[PDB]
Enzyme design. Structure first.
Site, PDB file in Angstrom:
ATOM      1  N   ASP A   1       0.796  -1.235   0.000  1.00 20.87           N
ATOM      2  CA  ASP A   1       0.000   0.000   0.000  1.00 20.87           C
ATOM      3  C   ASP A   1       0.831   1.289   0.000  1.00 20.87           C
ATOM      4  O   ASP A   1       0.578   2.246   0.745  1.00 20.87           O
ATOM      5  CB  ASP A   1      -1.007  -0.010   1.150  1.00 20.87           C
ATOM      6  CG  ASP A   1      -2.106  -1.088   0.912  1.00 20.87           C
ATOM      7  OD1 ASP A   1      -1.859  -2.306   1.255  1.00 20.87           O
ATOM      8  OD2 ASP A   1      -3.157  -0.811   0.285  1.00 20.87           O
TER       9      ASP A   1
ATOM     10  N   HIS B   1       0.901   3.671  -2.258  1.00 18.55           N
ATOM     11  CA  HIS B   1       0.055   4.800  -2.577  1.00 18.55           C
ATOM     12  C   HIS B   1       0.706   6.121  -2.962  1.00 18.55           C
ATOM     13  O   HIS B   1       0.347   7.134  -2.410  1.00 18.55           O
ATOM     14  CB  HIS B   1      -0.916   4.969  -1.415  1.00 18.55           C
ATOM     15  CG  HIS B   1      -2.025   3.990  -1.450  1.00 18.55           C
ATOM     16  ND1 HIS B   1      -2.465   3.260  -0.361  1.00 18.55           N
ATOM     17  CD2 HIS B   1      -2.716   3.537  -2.507  1.00 18.55           C
ATOM     18  CE1 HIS B   1      -3.473   2.482  -0.731  1.00 18.55           C
ATOM     19  NE2 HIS B   1      -3.631   2.618  -2.029  1.00 18.55           N
TER      20      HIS B   1
ATOM     21  N   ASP C   1      -1.099  -1.893  -4.426  1.00 23.21           N
ATOM     22  CA  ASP C   1      -1.596  -0.548  -4.337  1.00 23.21           C
ATOM     23  C   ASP C   1      -0.423   0.469  -4.262  1.00 23.21           C
ATOM     24  O   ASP C   1      -0.282   1.238  -3.298  1.00 23.21           O
ATOM     25  CB  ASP C   1      -2.517  -0.419  -3.153  1.00 23.21           C
ATOM     26  CG  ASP C   1      -3.972  -0.634  -3.496  1.00 23.21           C
ATOM     27  OD1 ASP C   1      -4.414  -1.161  -4.569  1.00 23.21           O
ATOM     28  OD2 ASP C   1      -4.798  -0.303  -2.640  1.00 23.21           O
TER      29      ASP C   1
ATOM     30  N   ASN D   1      -6.406  -3.097  -5.831  1.00 21.64           N
ATOM     31  CA  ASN D   1      -7.558  -2.535  -6.406  1.00 21.64           C
ATOM     32  C   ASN D   1      -7.216  -1.167  -7.013  1.00 21.64           C
ATOM     33  O   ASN D   1      -7.798  -0.812  -8.035  1.00 21.64           O
ATOM     34  CB  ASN D   1      -8.782  -2.410  -5.471  1.00 21.64           C
ATOM     35  CG  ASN D   1      -8.473  -1.735  -4.182  1.00 21.64           C
ATOM     36  OD1 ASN D   1      -7.562  -2.161  -3.543  1.00 21.64           O
ATOM     37  ND2 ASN D   1      -9.251  -0.736  -3.771  1.00 21.64           N
ATOM     38  N   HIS D   2      -6.322  -0.374  -6.371  1.00 26.48           N
ATOM     39  CA  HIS D   2      -6.023   0.948  -6.941  1.00 26.48           C
ATOM     40  C   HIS D   2      -5.172   0.935  -8.222  1.00 26.48           C
ATOM     41  O   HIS D   2      -5.006   1.968  -8.929  1.00 26.48           O
ATOM     42  CB  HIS D   2      -5.449   1.840  -5.862  1.00 26.48           C
ATOM     43  CG  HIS D   2      -6.523   2.368  -4.986  1.00 26.48           C
ATOM     44  ND1 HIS D   2      -6.868   1.809  -3.763  1.00 26.48           N
ATOM     45  CD2 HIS D   2      -7.270   3.471  -5.126  1.00 26.48           C
ATOM     46  CE1 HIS D   2      -7.895   2.499  -3.268  1.00 26.48           C
ATOM     47  NE2 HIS D   2      -8.145   3.496  -4.072  1.00 26.48           N
TER      48      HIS D   2
ATOM     49  N   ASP E   1      -7.464   2.233 -10.844  1.00 25.10           N
ATOM     50  CA  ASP E   1      -7.916   3.625 -10.818  1.00 25.10           C
ATOM     51  C   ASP E   1      -7.684   4.251 -12.159  1.00 25.10           C
ATOM     52  O   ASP E   1      -8.422   5.070 -12.525  1.00 25.10           O
ATOM     53  CB  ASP E   1      -7.198   4.465  -9.827  1.00 25.10           C
ATOM     54  CG  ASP E   1      -7.518   4.083  -8.444  1.00 25.10           C
ATOM     55  OD1 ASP E   1      -8.510   3.346  -8.280  1.00 25.10           O
ATOM     56  OD2 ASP E   1      -6.870   4.494  -7.462  1.00 25.10           O
TER      57      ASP E   1
ATOM     58  N   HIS F   1      -3.492  -8.867  -2.021  1.00 25.59           N
ATOM     59  CA  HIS F   1      -4.107  -7.571  -1.731  1.00 25.59           C
ATOM     60  C   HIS F   1      -5.568  -7.751  -1.345  1.00 25.59           C
ATOM     61  O   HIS F   1      -6.476  -7.448  -2.118  1.00 25.59           O
ATOM     62  CB  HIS F   1      -4.005  -6.643  -2.948  1.00 25.59           C
ATOM     63  CG  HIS F   1      -4.050  -5.219  -2.582  1.00 25.59           C
ATOM     64  ND1 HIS F   1      -3.749  -4.251  -3.452  1.00 25.59           N
ATOM     65  CD2 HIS F   1      -4.043  -4.633  -1.398  1.00 25.59           C
ATOM     66  CE1 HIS F   1      -3.801  -3.091  -2.841  1.00 25.59           C
ATOM     67  NE2 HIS F   1      -4.017  -3.296  -1.586  1.00 25.59           N
TER      68      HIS F   1
ATOM     69  N   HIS G   1      -3.984  -4.043   1.457  1.00 19.53           N
ATOM     70  CA  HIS G   1      -5.329  -3.537   1.344  1.00 19.53           C
ATOM     71  C   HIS G   1      -6.019  -3.025   2.671  1.00 19.53           C
ATOM     72  O   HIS G   1      -6.546  -1.900   2.749  1.00 19.53           O
ATOM     73  CB  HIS G   1      -6.183  -4.569   0.617  1.00 19.53           C
ATOM     74  CG  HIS G   1      -7.595  -4.171   0.453  1.00 19.53           C
ATOM     75  ND1 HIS G   1      -7.943  -3.067  -0.246  1.00 19.53           N
ATOM     76  CD2 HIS G   1      -8.761  -4.702   0.923  1.00 19.53           C
ATOM     77  CE1 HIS G   1      -9.268  -2.936  -0.277  1.00 19.53           C
ATOM     78  NE2 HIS G   1      -9.791  -3.931   0.403  1.00 19.53           N
TER      79      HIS G   1
ATOM     80  N   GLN H   1      -4.314  -2.157   5.287  1.00 16.08           N
ATOM     81  CA  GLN H   1      -3.405  -1.042   5.722  1.00 16.08           C
ATOM     82  C   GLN H   1      -3.202  -1.068   7.279  1.00 16.08           C
ATOM     83  O   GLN H   1      -3.560  -0.184   7.960  1.00 16.08           O
ATOM     84  CB  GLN H   1      -3.904   0.306   5.192  1.00 16.08           C
ATOM     85  CG  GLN H   1      -3.831   0.218   3.688  1.00 16.08           C
ATOM     86  CD  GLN H   1      -4.189   1.533   2.886  1.00 16.08           C
ATOM     87  OE1 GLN H   1      -4.726   1.445   1.767  1.00 16.08           O
ATOM     88  NE2 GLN H   1      -3.818   2.677   3.422  1.00 16.08           N
TER      89      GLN H   1
ATOM     90  N   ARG I   1     -12.925  30.242   7.583  1.00 17.59           N
ATOM     91  CA  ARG I   1     -13.190  29.411   8.748  1.00 17.59           C
ATOM     92  C   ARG I   1     -14.528  29.698   9.408  1.00 17.59           C
ATOM     93  O   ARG I   1     -15.276  28.746   9.726  1.00 17.59           O
ATOM     94  CB  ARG I   1     -12.094  29.566   9.774  1.00 17.59           C
ATOM     95  CG  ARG I   1     -12.301  30.727  10.779  1.00 17.59           C
ATOM     96  CD  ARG I   1     -11.121  30.975  11.674  1.00 17.59           C
ATOM     97  NE  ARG I   1     -10.117  29.936  11.463  1.00 17.59           N
ATOM     98  CZ  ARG I   1      -9.498  29.248  12.416  1.00 17.59           C
ATOM     99  NH1 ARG I   1      -9.730  29.513  13.706  1.00 17.59           N
ATOM    100  NH2 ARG I   1      -8.607  28.294  12.072  1.00 17.59           N
TER     101      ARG I   1
ATOM    102  N   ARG J   1     -18.106  27.014   9.496  1.00 14.16           N
ATOM    103  CA  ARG J   1     -18.467  26.584  10.880  1.00 14.16           C
ATOM    104  C   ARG J   1     -19.738  27.214  11.417  1.00 14.16           C
ATOM    105  O   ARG J   1     -19.965  27.169  12.612  1.00 14.16           O
ATOM    106  CB  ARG J   1     -17.353  26.967  11.893  1.00 14.16           C
ATOM    107  CG  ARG J   1     -16.021  26.275  11.586  1.00 14.16           C
ATOM    108  CD  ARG J   1     -14.824  26.692  12.487  1.00 14.16           C
ATOM    109  NE  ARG J   1     -13.660  25.960  11.969  1.00 14.16           N
ATOM    110  CZ  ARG J   1     -12.504  25.764  12.594  1.00 14.16           C
ATOM    111  NH1 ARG J   1     -12.276  26.313  13.787  1.00 14.16           N
ATOM    112  NH2 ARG J   1     -11.548  25.032  12.002  1.00 14.16           N
TER     113      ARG J   1
ATOM    114  N   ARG K   1     -10.493  24.324   4.590  1.00 12.10           N
ATOM    115  CA  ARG K   1      -9.429  25.123   5.166  1.00 12.10           C
ATOM    116  C   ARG K   1      -9.064  26.365   4.386  1.00 12.10           C
ATOM    117  O   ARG K   1      -8.132  27.005   4.756  1.00 12.10           O
ATOM    118  CB  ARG K   1      -8.148  24.297   5.323  1.00 12.10           C
ATOM    119  CG  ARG K   1      -8.397  22.924   5.945  1.00 12.10           C
ATOM    120  CD  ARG K   1      -8.897  23.036   7.371  1.00 12.10           C
ATOM    121  NE  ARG K   1      -7.802  23.486   8.228  1.00 12.10           N
ATOM    122  CZ  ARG K   1      -7.889  23.563   9.551  1.00 12.10           C
ATOM    123  NH1 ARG K   1      -9.006  23.195  10.183  1.00 12.10           N
ATOM    124  NH2 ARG K   1      -6.824  23.936  10.239  1.00 12.10           N
TER     125      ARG K   1
HETATM  126 NI    NI Z   1      -6.554  -1.501  -1.425  1.00 10.70          NI
END
Ligand code: NI
EC number: 3.6.1.45
Length: 525
Positions: free
Chosen positions: A16, A18, A59, A91-92, A95, A192, A227, A229, A350, A354, A385
């Protein structure tokens, strides 16, 4: 092999990743320090008479702007320089289109494995199911498997001709083919699929524990996973340590004679399983998870705040930093490129976020529902933000609005779970980060109860199914939001908040803010 001889085999693993080819902003992880660590392991292992196999649980793709905008090229090249032997497909990896994944397979000097992914129109494997390695005179097979949640949870337009078969069933078949043909001495699965305590996968597809329990005993020496993580470091039988601490002892899981390991995510660790093989039998002799410059945030007595290393610092390999730097530089320049335009100010000051419903909330939440195919959606206003000024929009502006890398998630729920959730969520107050932004939601709250509750203009039907999007933070109880992660219907997509807002802006541009302007659909008192 030779009878009555002990072979030494060291199995290294990550998962993972990423897109984390570069260290993060506090100086943790990155492939440069990975390379220094793994190079030193290889020499030590060799000095002691053993061999190394280095595997990934997949991943590689998706998680960091500079990697994603360059199709993870830096990541895969970096992995070549570390010297990966094989990887499971994650799986990623889906993407992006197949055009990109096939290009990754050619960038990578190691195989990307998966035995369980087939083309529906022909019945043929899309990938290699296993790879064979020679170490000494041992034959070692590594099989790859990918979660079959991929296609319930990824872009449906990509899976028209791609079928994900049950992995545990595929592993039984591949193990039988291997044992009848190539006859490896050792078989390992890189997967995975995820580690769930005691095989309690809930509504996720079954993972590594259930598989190892389903396979013939000891048929795999080990499963190198991903997967979910998690660092797989057991507190007790069938229970992972919660809040594992880097640099401490890590006992991996063993189920039905089969070791199961995982190294968390993002190159935070290199796992190291040392084995001794004699007369057909694998014995695990040492295991550790080795931190890659992981640090803890501390505030001492004097308000001086730092990040303190858990283990001694690993130097960045310079050759990996030369390889990676041009990608890091191109990625930072790509952030400043126009990805869209808005015809008015998106408001993320901000106070506004809020206190009342803003057009930034609606933009973010539309982006999250577009990504998950959701019906409605909510988040914390204090998640927003910054504003985006009227005019051109770069990924850099979007990173200012969503700078902390939270993960988008969704939940399928009955109209009645919808009513119970939005109810307790509409108890959250103004002048507070927890203040809900909503989308495709209309109501009048009075006395902590909802009147004329509408998802997308229609009243709710308690036996209908609805898909909600939100963030991982809100979904796991953050802001005192009702937990969704231990519910059936919950899915953690792994997609990052800024990437989701950026993609949505790129495909919707130019934006017309009036479609995002709140018209009093939610109100209180
Ligand atoms: Ni995954």
């Amino acid at each position: 092999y030779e009878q009555d001889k002990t072979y030494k085999i060291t199995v290294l693993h990550t998962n993972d990743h990423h897109g984390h080819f570069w260290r993060n902003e506090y100086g943790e992880y990155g492939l440069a320090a990975q390379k220094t660590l793994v190079d030193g392991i290889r020499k030590e292992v060799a000095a002691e008479g053993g061999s190394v196999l280095l595997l990934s649980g997949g991943d590689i793709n998706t998680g960091v702007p500079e990697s994603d905008l360059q199709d993870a090229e830096p990541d895969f090249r970096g992995m070549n320089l570390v010297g990966y032997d094989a990887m499971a497909i994650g799986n990623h990896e889906f993407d992006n289109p197949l055009t990109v994944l096939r290009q990754q397979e050619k960038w990578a000097k190691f195989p990307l494995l998966s035995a369980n992914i087939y083309q529906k129109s022909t019945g043929e494997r899309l990938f290699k199911p296993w790879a064979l390695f020679k170490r000494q005179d041992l034959k070692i097979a590594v099989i790859g498997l990918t979660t079959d949640d991929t296609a319930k949870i990824g872009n449906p337009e990509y899976f028209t001709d791609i079928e994900f078969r049950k992995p545990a069933d595929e592993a039984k078949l591949v193990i039988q083919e291997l044992q009848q043909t190539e006859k490896p001495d050792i078989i390992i699965a890189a997967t995975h699929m995820g580690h769930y305590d005691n095989g309690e996968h809930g509504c996720n597809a079954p993972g590594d524990v259930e598989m190892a329990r389903a396979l013939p005993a000891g048929s795999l020496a080990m499963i190198v996973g991903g997967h979910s993580q998690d660092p797989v470091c057991m507190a007790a039988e069938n229970k992972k340590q919660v809040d594992y601490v880097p640099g401490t002892p890590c006992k991996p899981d063993q189920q039905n004679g089969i070791w199961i390991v995982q190294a968390h995510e993002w190159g935070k660790y290199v796992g190291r399983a040392d084995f001794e093989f004699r007369n057909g039998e694998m014995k695990m002799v040492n295991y550790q998870l080795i931190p890659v410059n992981l640090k803890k945030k501390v505030t001492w007595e004097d308000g001086k705040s730092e990040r303190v290393l858990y283990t001694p610092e690993i130097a960045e390999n310079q050759q990996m930093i030369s390889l990676l730097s041009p990608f890091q530089n191109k990625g930072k320049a790509q952030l400043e490129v126009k990805i869209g335009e808005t015809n008015g100010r998106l408001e993320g000051d901000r106070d506004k976020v809020r206190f009342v419903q803003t057009n930034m909330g609606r933009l973010i939440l539309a982006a999250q529902m577009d990504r998950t195919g959701a019906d409605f959606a909510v988040m914390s206003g204090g998640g927003i933000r910054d504003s985006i000024e009227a005019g051109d929009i770069s990924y850099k502006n979007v990173l200012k609005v969503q700078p902390f890398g939270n993960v988008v998630v969704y939940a399928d729920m009955t109209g009645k779970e919808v009513i119970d959730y939005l109810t307790a969520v509409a108890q959250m107050k103004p002048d507070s980060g927890a203040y809900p932004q909503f989308a495709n939601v209309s109501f009048v709250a009075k006395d902590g109860k909802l009147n004329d509750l509408k998802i997308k203009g229609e009243p709710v039907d308690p036996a209908k199914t609805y898909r909600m999007a939100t963030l991982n933070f809100n979904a796991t109880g953050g802001d005192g939001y009702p937990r969704l992660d231990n519910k059936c219907g919950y899915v953690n997509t792994g997609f990052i908040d800024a990437e989701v807002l950026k993609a949505y802006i790129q495909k919707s541009s130019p934006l017309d803010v009036s479609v995002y302007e709140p018209k009093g659909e939610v109100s209180w008192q």
